[PDB]
Every structure is written in structure tokens, then in C-alpha cells.
Amino acid sequence: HSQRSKKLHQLSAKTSRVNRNRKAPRLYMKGTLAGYTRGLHGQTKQTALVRVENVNTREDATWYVGKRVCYVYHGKKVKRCVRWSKAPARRSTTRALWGRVTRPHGNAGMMRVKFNGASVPASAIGRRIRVYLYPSQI
Amino acid sequence: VSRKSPEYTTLRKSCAPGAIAIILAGRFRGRRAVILKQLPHNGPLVVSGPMKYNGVPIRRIDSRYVIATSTTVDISSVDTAPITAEVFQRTLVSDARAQLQKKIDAALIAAIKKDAQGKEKAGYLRSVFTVKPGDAPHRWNW
Amino acid sequence: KSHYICAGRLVRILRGPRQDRVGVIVDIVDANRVLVENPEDAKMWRHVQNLKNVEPLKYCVSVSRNCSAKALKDALASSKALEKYAKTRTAARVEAKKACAVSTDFERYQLRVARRSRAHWARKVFDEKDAKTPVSWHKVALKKMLKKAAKMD
Amino acid sequence: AFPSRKDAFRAQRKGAKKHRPEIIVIDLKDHVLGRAAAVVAKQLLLGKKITVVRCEQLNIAGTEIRNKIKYLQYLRKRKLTNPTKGPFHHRAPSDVFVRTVRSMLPRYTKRGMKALNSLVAYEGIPPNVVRTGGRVVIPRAQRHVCYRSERPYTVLGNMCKHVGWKYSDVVANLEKARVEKASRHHEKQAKLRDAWKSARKEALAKMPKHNVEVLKKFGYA
RNA sequence: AUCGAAUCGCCACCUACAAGACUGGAGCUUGCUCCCUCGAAGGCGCCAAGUAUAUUCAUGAUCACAAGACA
RNA sequence: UUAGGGAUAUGUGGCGUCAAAACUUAUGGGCUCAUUCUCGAUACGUAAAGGGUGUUGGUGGCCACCGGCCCCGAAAAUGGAUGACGCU
Ligand SMILES: [Mg+2]
Ligand SMILES: [Mg+2]
Ligand code: NA
């Protein structure tokens, strides 16, 4: 209401600025859980199949053999985590399951992964997997 | 030579003192530091930022959580950092470690400045590494 | 217009172990295959190439079919088609691609700062010229609102 | 679906921003129907969110009469004792594409149902999609690389309007108005585009020299 | 108000349109030659608002969902 | 050809989606267009004579004959099947 003066000042200041993204970096690659190893007869759930962005070749997929892999999700209640006492800021409904890359699959860059002591749940099919850069050989 | 001797190591040649490394995990993930030495008995590496540039103090780190690039800085600092410096009894920094930090960092900064390409190396140490959409780290040289 | 397949025509290899190398057509076998050689390159001895794997360039050294290596070397040198090919932007793009493929973390950092410097100076120059001739959305709106503000307020 | 008042109340209480999920918009003009469907179904199973536009411009190999006869053979399938239960034959091009994709998914399973519900299809380009960003194509399913040029081919909207689709003229008029609007705006933005081009061309004198050398070495001159 | 949660690029320079037997512009020798935009990059973003001896980072103690957060 | 479980490699059969595998491989060669059951496409397993300048080659003398794919010849009873979608 007769306060066009505020909108008059904002235009005059307007210079060329950009968003510039200076935030906490991500140190992993994005993959997806395609499914389990299977044939026409049925599936074996002890091995999972993972497809990673920009990895489209068997030679590419060999680079990741041995790297660690994570599936992040959430539950309904807050339960125990690592550093539950030392760092109370970590406490949440967020949880993760860990595994390792074992070998490539096919010629197109898919890889086989094995999880620690148990199978990954089938509710993760079609969802995101983190593939880290460690342990490192470089 | 003897495996029981503390001098015995198996570290890969890329992680040699003076090499500039990228941190892959921990509180300082993504920062770049300088490898000072490896602790005895085939122990971890010790790295420092220096803390003026990127804020990374003297710290132990496993060589499996590091990428050792081919860029190097010539270091001839006193390097009097044993295992006891990082062992503690059963914003707050002790007056001994606080002094050791300065004694090392001044020498490290003098070495970087004395090096050619010193300004570029300082900026390189100040920058932060990240994985962008569309990136393919498996295809790169380091 | 298009560059015909003919004896003496320069080509670039598309895929395979000889990718992004330049040769000269010395003979046509049939609709699918040619014989290619480049004396001034190490891996381009006389060999067979499928016509789906080549890219015809704009230069043709004038030679007859199944010519000798001696007669093709000097014809190349006199034509100076290689010194001409090295000056185009597609040749420079190929060399840039190789240089980028073989690069260290330090060099990638150098390129990043060079591009940031260019962008900063470009946006500065743009702001200065937009001050004179208003072309940004905010400057167009400012000039549209100035006349209204001159009255009343 | 109109959002509920409880959702609006929660959004106000949280005080967040306007959220948009990650969506890929595919321009389907001059794409091969079966190959585009085969690629899209696999991406949907891998978990993407996809919207397709310009479904009336898909292509099928062969003549229009042959393809129309195939459709009429499909149309005559009908549960004799009660046709309100028999196969339902959709006539619009976007519904044709959706059925083709549905046949390449495990529809009876919930996973298949989620994948199918993650796809949206349109005829033409609607105004709620026009401004969302650059559209994409599928290189391995384009006509100019898939068909030999000498053979005849069909256009899906032309085939559909003879078996019963009744909105071809509406879509044509809408697309005409759309293209005129976009062209006028594009021409209006030319001064801005040229100013930015000139600014980049001229900053090479004001930057430091040793940066320009790196640009030249990596081919960004 | 429950609510802690999975997701980890942004743009008022992409977010207009057509062709692929053919496609910057000229010739006449219609497949060669000559001209110059050289015909194989949307723009930014990745730690000093910008390429320059400026500057707090620790004890969160060697991995753990990024203890951060929607540039 | 078979005790209860891991890893590696194979057989028959496969590698557009359903559905693991060439994210539709090759920097291999030929051939083929089929309009109301319909080109064709996993053996065992559920169409003939005769015609065709449709197209591709072969023998002997622009001709006569012999081939390869495709097209007529080819007509039943609820709506429906290369397994489905589709593929040129
Ligand atoms: Mg967390
Ligand atoms: Mg598969
Ligand atoms: Na089958």
C-alpha cells in the first residue's frame, strides 16, 4: 500500500550473483538396487545386483571391486547407533546396512554385492545405494 | 627388514612423505592435507593441513582412507612426532600439542612458499574435493 | 557440401585401436572396404578399413590408385594437407580431448580456477554494459517502474 | 488430486519451500514406438519418474492401412457374455503408448504397479510442462537411425483418428498456439543472449594471461 | 502440535522450431575450388565475489546415515 | 541323474522388455515387404500340384531351363494367441 518504494530499491541493487553451492561435499557415488541374482527357475538372495551411474563397462566395474556399499533407510522408532553416547546428535530413525562389491556382472557395468551376514531386504529394490571410494588403492 | 622390527613397513609407494592427499572419510572428508610420516610398526600415516589453509590439524589416518596424488611438496621439517603424542591417559588443546602444531606448521608453510608454484599449491591445498553429477572417478589420473 | 570417397582423400578413424588418427585413401576394394596408409604416422601402415569406421575430410591429395609409398609421401608433403588439418578447430578439439584424458588433480584444479576467473570477469563486464543499455530483467523492470514512481511518490 | 486441508496445514506449520521431485521429460516426436517403450519400461523398473510428451507423433513401421487393420483386429476382441468386463480398447495416442508400456511390466505384482504409476503421458506439450527445463530424446530409438528411408511408415495420431480418437483438431490448434508463443519469446530474448556472448568474448582481455594459457591448452578458448 | 526420519545440481543464457539423400556463404569445372564464423561442447557451479604472502578451524582423538543441509 | 551347506566353472537353452545376460555387441557378408486367422521366428509336435517379370543368381545358347526369399492356390462355427507386447 504505497510501498512501491521498497520494490524500487531492490531492483536498483540487483547485480549479477550466482548460487555457488558451498556445502558439505558428498564422497560417494549413486547406485540403484536392480534385484538379486536369478535364473528362470528362481532367485538366490545372498547376492545383490547394483547399477551405478556413469559406470557402463566391465573394465569400469572392475575398478570398484572391494569398495564398501551402504543402504540407508528409516524405521519407526529411535534405536541404538554408533556413538549413541559420545555424539547424541546422531540419534534418529535413520539406519543403514553395509556390504562390499565382489565382482562385475555382464559386460555393461553392473556389479555383484554381498551384504554383512544377511540379505538386503526386498523393499530396497529400485532404491538408492551409496558406493564409497574406500578402501582405496590409489 | 625383520617383520618384528618397527622399521618394517609395506606402504604403497604413492603415499610417500610430502605427498598431497585427499581425505575420503571422517570429520575432514574432502579436504586436502600433506602426508608427514608413517608411524612405526606399520602404523597409520600422520597428516597436517596445515590448519591455517584448510583447518586440518595433526592427525592419524589409515592409508586406505586416502588418495595419494602425484603432486608433491618437498618437506624437511623436524618431524619429532612419536606414538606417545597421540596416546591419552585414562577448543581444549594441551600446551604441548598446541606448541607442536605451531612448530610443524611454520616449517611446512615455509616449505610450500619456498617451492615453485607456491601460490598455486596453496590454492590447491585450500580447495575442496567432491563428486559431482556426471563424474567418473574410475577413469581419472591422480 | 559432402566429401566424396576417392583415391587420395584424407580420412579420420572413428572407433577401434586407431581411433582419432588421420590417413589417406590409396585404394578402393568395394562398397565397404578401402586401403589406408599414413607414412608420417607410426601405426598407420598400409591396412584395410571398413567404410563405416572412417570420416572423410575436406582435403584430397592428387594421386593414382595403388600408388607407391615413395609417391604418396612426397605428394602429401607438397600438398601440405597435414599442416592445414592441424589448424582447424576439430583438430584442436581432438588434442584437447587427449590432454583432458591424461590429466592430474592439480591440472584439473588449474582448469577450474581459469574458468572461474573467466566467468567472474564476464559477469563484471556484463553488469557494466547493462548499466548503460538495460537488458536484464531487473533493469527492464526498473526502467518500467521509474516513470510511474516519478509521478506521485 | 486436490490436496487436503490437513496437508496444507502441515505444510504451513513446517514452513518449507515448494518441492518438486526429480522428473525426466521425453519428447517422443519421431521415435519408434516399440523401442521407446522397451527403454522406458526398464527405466521405470530402475526407479525413475518419467513424463512423455507429443505422443501423437510416434512412428510405426509399415503402411497406415496395415497398422489400422492390426488395430481393428485388436478392437474385435470382446467378452461375448458380458462386454462391460471384456478388454477395454483405448483410442488416444497417449493411452496407446501407456498400454504398450504396461505390457512390458509385471503388472499383477505391486512392484509393477508402482512402476506403471510413475509414468505420465500427454498429447502435445501442456502448459504445466512447458517451462520445467530442457527435454530429452532417446538416441537408440529415433526414426532417422532406425528405419531405412525408402520404406513407408505410419504416424500414430493419423492412425488413431481413423479408429476413433476425436481430439486431433483440438491438439493441432493447441500446438500451433504453443509454437507461436515460444517463438515470439525466443526472438525477444535475442538481445540478452548476444550481450552475454559478447561479454564472454571480451573478458579474455581482462582476465590474467596465465589463466588464458590454461584455457587454450584444454581447448576452451 | 505430534515429526525423528529415506532422497544430496542450480539457472528470468537449456527450458523455441525443423531436417539427416545433408544441412555457414559463394561459384561452375555438380564434385571440386574459394571465402571465414573453420562447421565435434547450453551457461554456471566444486571453498578469498576471484587468482593475489588474507583468514577461526584441533580433544568430534584412525571407518561408521553428512553430528550438515536443502546454493 | 539326487547326504546338509559355501565358492569357482560348465551342460541343454539363451542375451529388446516381461526375465539373469551384447545398458538394442561388431571397427561381419548376403536376402526379404507380407494390406481382417497371416511375413517370419526353439527340434520331437498339430498343406500339395500349378502359377508370378515381385525381387535376387545360375547353366547352356535376348532366349530356354534350374535355384533363393516373397505372393496367389488356402473355406467354419464364444473373443484370442511366434507364450504376451512388439520388431522391418
Ligand atoms: Mg544423518
Ligand atoms: Mg536384464
Ligand atoms: Na518364446
Side-chain angles (χ1 to χ4, degrees), chain A residues 1-13 15-58 60-137, chain B residues 1 5-6 8-12 14-82 84-88 91-94 96-98 100-102 104-118 121-142, chain C residues 1-69 71-79 81-82 84-129 131 133-143 145-146 149-153, chain D residues 1-16 19-190 192-200 202-208 210-221:
Chain A
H1 195 322
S2 289
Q3 307 288 54
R4 39 166 187 292
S5 57
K6 206 202 313 287
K7 262 56 143 173
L8 235 205
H9 301 322
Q10 285 140 207
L11 301 190
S12 14
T15 183
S16 279
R17 316 277 286 185
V18 285
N19 278 152
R20 292 221 305 186
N21 183 13
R22 273 152 209 224
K23 293 200 296 185
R26 82 148 144 109
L27 267 297
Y28 60 90
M29 303 260 300
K30 297 144 121 208
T32 302
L33 181 72
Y36 308 103
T37 52
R38 64 181 296 170
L40 289 169
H41 62 275
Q43 77 184 2
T44 89
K45 284 172 85 158
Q46 72 268 14
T47 308
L49 294 179
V50 178
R51 144 83 57 205
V52 176
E53 309 189 1
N54 295 289
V55 181
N56 58 6
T57 260
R58 185 151 177 119
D60 293 347
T62 296
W63 199 82
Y64 291 88
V65 173
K67 298 278 176 318
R68 278 166 79 192
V69 127
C70 179
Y71 167 59
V72 178
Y73 64 104
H74 69 78
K76 298 193 142 142
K77 316 278 208 73
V78 176
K79 308 226 193 233
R80 284 323 198 85
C81 65
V82 180
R83 294 199 171 81
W84 166 279
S85 276
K86 298 259 148 49
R90 298 197 80 246
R91 300 183 197 181
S92 59
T93 37
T94 302
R95 298 159 200 192
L97 307 164
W98 285 88
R100 301 226 183 193
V101 177
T102 58
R103 52 181 279 184
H105 195 250
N107 318 286
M110 188 96 36
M111 48 212 71
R112 301 185 196 185
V113 317
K114 181 102 50 162
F115 286 87
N116 286 164
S119 285
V120 72
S123 53
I125 285 166
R127 296 177 103 137
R128 168 83 60 235
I129 308 288
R130 299 173 173 203
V131 186
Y132 284 91
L133 298 187
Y134 53 75
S136 150
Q137 281 109 285
Chain B
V1 160
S5 94
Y8 160 89
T9 73
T10 62
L11 196 60
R12 56 181 189 261
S14 88
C15 297
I20 288 169
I22 299 167
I23 319 283
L24 295 173
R27 177 192 185 171
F28 301 111
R29 54 175 69 78
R31 290 335 275 260
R32 296 192 170 86
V34 177
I35 309 189
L36 299 168
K37 44 174 283 183
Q38 190 199 6
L39 287 181
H41 285 277
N42 219 15
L45 322 167
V46 294
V47 306
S48 176
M51 190 167 80
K52 148 178 289 305
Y53 291 169
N54 40 51
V56 183
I58 281 179
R59 230 162 171 269
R60 295 187 294 179
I61 192 167
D62 221 287
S63 88
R64 290 305 185 184
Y65 300 96
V66 127
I67 287 180
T69 79
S70 75
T71 326
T72 42
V73 151
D74 202 294
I75 67 149
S76 290
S77 317
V78 86
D79 256 316
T80 70
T84 37
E86 278 104 16
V87 156
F88 52 70
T91 190
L92 182 164
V93 171
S94 102
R97 166 99 50 110
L100 170 73
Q101 167 93 62
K102 227 184 78 174
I104 299 301
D105 274 19
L108 192 57
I109 292 191
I112 299 157
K113 287 172 88 327
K114 131 165 93 157
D115 185 4
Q117 309 185 116
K121 295 280 176 63
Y124 185 52
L125 285 161
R126 289 189 192 95
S127 76
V128 174
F129 164 79
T130 172
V131 183
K132 305 190 305 298
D135 272 343
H138 44 96
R139 310 223 183 117
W140 287 347
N141 276 304
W142 307 88
Chain C
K1 215 153 191 18
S2 34
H3 321 308
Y4 284 24
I5 290 299
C6 61
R9 161 83 51 204
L10 275 73
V11 290
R12 183 172 61 234
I13 314 303
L14 298 175
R15 301 207 280 177
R18 285 178 175 113
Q19 168 186 302
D20 277 325
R21 282 171 193 247
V22 282
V24 184
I25 290 179
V26 297
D27 222 344
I28 304 160
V29 186
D30 51 348
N32 304 132
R33 284 176 292 159
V34 295
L35 282 155
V36 178
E37 154 140 44
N38 183 6
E40 280 56 0
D41 187 36
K43 303 297 217 192
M44 297 307 270
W45 56 86
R46 190 161 294 190
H47 67 277
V48 177
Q49 282 271 337
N50 207 267
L51 269 170
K52 267 134 42 172
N53 203 43
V54 310
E55 175 65 29
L57 304 178
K58 51 155 45 73
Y59 320 91
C60 183
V61 303
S62 42
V63 86
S64 325
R65 311 171 54 153
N66 180 9
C67 65
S68 55
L72 186 269
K73 186 177 196 60
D74 45 345
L76 243 184
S78 140
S79 147
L82 292 191
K84 290 151 155 272
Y85 177 69
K87 284 191 281 151
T88 66
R89 326 265 38 81
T90 206
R93 191 71 81 75
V94 168
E95 307 298 39
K97 182 180 41 182
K98 302 159 82 271
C100 155
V102 186
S103 73
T104 80
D105 206 38
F106 193 47
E107 306 179 278
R108 288 198 285 284
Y109 158 81
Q110 282 172 315
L111 180 67
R112 182 158 75 244
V113 319
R115 278 169 72 71
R116 224 212 311 271
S117 206
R118 208 254 284 274
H120 172 263
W121 275 106
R123 69 171 60 94
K124 165 176 302 177
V125 156
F126 182 86
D127 285 340
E128 308 194 343
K129 295 218 153 102
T133 76
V135 96
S136 211
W137 73 267
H138 47 89
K139 286 335 172 209
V140 154
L142 187 73
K143 188 174 66 32
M145 216 216 285
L146 221 68
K151 253 62 82 203
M152 334 157 295
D153 172 275
Chain D
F2 207 86
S4 63
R5 263 145 47 131
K6 159 138 144 214
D7 309 6
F9 200 5
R10 183 183 193 275
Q12 177 196 42
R13 246 140 58 219
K14 287 307 177 170
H19 182 264
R20 183 179 167 82
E22 287 304 333
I23 303 172
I24 304 160
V25 182
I26 308 177
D27 188 9
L28 275 186
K29 165 184 155 71
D30 289 327
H31 278 66
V32 182
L33 169 64
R35 308 178 106 91
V39 173
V40 157
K42 193 53 169 189
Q43 294 304 296
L44 288 170
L45 282 170
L46 281 178
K48 298 295 205 315
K49 304 177 184 294
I50 290 166
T51 291
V52 293
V53 296
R54 302 224 267 183
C55 288
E56 82 273 2
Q57 312 246 34
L58 281 155
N59 290 155
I60 312 171
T63 43
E64 208 212 280
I65 178 57
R66 177 220 273 174
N67 288 127
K68 180 190 151 144
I69 280 185
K70 294 227 208 99
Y71 192 87
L72 292 167
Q73 285 300 309
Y74 168 53
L75 177 56
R76 108 190 283 274
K77 265 71 180 172
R78 183 183 92 141
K79 168 151 184 169
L80 170 72
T81 56
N82 195 350
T84 64
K85 291 154 168 355
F88 306 120
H89 326 268
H90 294 252
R91 286 137 156 103
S94 52
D95 296 337
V96 164
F97 185 74
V98 165
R99 169 183 182 251
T100 316
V101 174
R102 187 184 68 218
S103 290
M104 303 184 190
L105 294 170
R107 64 180 298 191
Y108 303 114
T109 85
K110 257 169 212 191
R111 174 178 162 251
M113 281 318 297
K114 274 158 82 263
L116 179 67
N117 283 152
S118 311
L119 163 75
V120 184
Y122 291 117
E123 280 110 37
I125 311 182
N128 65 307
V129 186
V130 157
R131 291 198 207 180
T132 43
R135 266 89 73 183
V136 315
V137 305
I138 318 169
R140 77 188 61 201
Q142 282 182 123
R143 171 161 60 82
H144 66 111
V145 309
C146 280
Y147 298 162
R148 283 256 136 201
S149 280
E150 299 92 297
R151 309 243 187 228
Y153 61 90
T154 309
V155 183
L156 189 56
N158 293 169
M159 181 205 92
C160 282
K161 76 165 297 183
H162 299 313
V163 296
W165 185 47
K166 55 173 68 147
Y167 296 107
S168 34
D169 305 309
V170 177
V171 173
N173 291 325
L174 287 182
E175 278 308 277
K176 223 184 102 45
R178 210 262 301 169
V179 169
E180 262 133 17
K181 177 162 192 192
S183 147
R184 284 200 307 268
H185 184 249
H186 183 264
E187 175 32 18
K188 145 183 201 89
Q189 297 294 75
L192 174 92
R193 281 193 311 271
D194 305 347
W196 270 119
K197 225 148 203 299
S198 163
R200 298 198 222 95
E202 153 214 355
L204 276 167
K206 335 272 271 164
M207 35 191 322
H210 77 102
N211 286 169
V212 183
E213 300 314 293
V214 184
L215 290 178
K216 279 205 214 95
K217 167 192 168 181
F218 283 104
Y220 282 100

